[PDB]
From a paper:
Bromodomains (BRDs) are protein interaction modules that specifically recognize ε-N-lysine acetylation motifs, a key event in the reading process of epigenetic marks. The 61 BRDs in the human genome cluster into eight families based on structure/sequence similarity. Despite large sequence variations, all BRD modules share a conserved fold that comprises a left-handed bundle of four α helices (αZ, αA, αB, αC), linked by loop regions of variable length (ZA and BC loops), which line the Kac binding site and determine binding specificity. The four helices form a deep cavity that is extended by the two loop regions (ZA and BC loops), creating a largely hydrophobic Kac binding pocket.
BRDs are evolutionarily conserved and present in diverse nuclear proteins comprising HATs (GCN5, PCAF), ATP-dependent chromatin-remodeling complexes (BAZ1B), helicases (SMARCA), methyltransferases (MLL, ASH1L), transcriptional coactivators (TRIM/TIF1, TAFs) transcriptional mediators (TAF1), nuclear-scaffolding proteins (PB1), and the BET family (Muller et al., 2011). The most notable structural difference within the BRD core fold is a hairpin insertion located between helix αZ and the ZA loop that is present in all family VIII members. The proximity to the Kac binding site suggests that this insert may play a role in recruitment of acetylated binding partners. The nuclear body protein SP140 as well as the related protein LOC93349 and PCAF showed nonspecific binding to most peptides. In contrast, the second, fourth, fifth, and sixth BRD of PB1, MLL, and TRIM28 interacted with only a few histone Kac peptides.
Author numbering: 176 to 291
The structure:
Amino acid sequence: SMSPAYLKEILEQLLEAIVVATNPSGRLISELFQKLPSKVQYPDYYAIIKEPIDLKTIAQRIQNGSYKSIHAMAKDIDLLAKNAKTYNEPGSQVFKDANSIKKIFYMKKAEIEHHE
Ligand SMILES: [Cl-]
Ligand SMILES: [Cl-]
Ligand SMILES: [Zn+2]
Ligand SMILES: [Zn+2]
């Protein structure tokens, strides 16, 4: 049973891996995932997406100690990606970036959990 302090460091490392990741273009994969869209300008989004989430919210949850396991953060990352892949058309760059974020997260998780 790792301490809350140890868990936090792990979660921070996972988030960092996501937010520093770049595409071949050099663009940050995380760019369009930092902040949810305006409720005023994009009301359709909130009618369609039942549980909105963004990277800012996930970061806040890490700081709040809201997550009691790496799994809980992982489920939020899954949701982050699922929502983008629900509201946005497949093949789109946002769709691709959603998957890339998951790939980065789970690769980093494995690196951390399996290193010996
Ligand atoms: Cl495993
Ligand atoms: Cl494992
Ligand atoms: Zn394992
Ligand atoms: Zn090692």
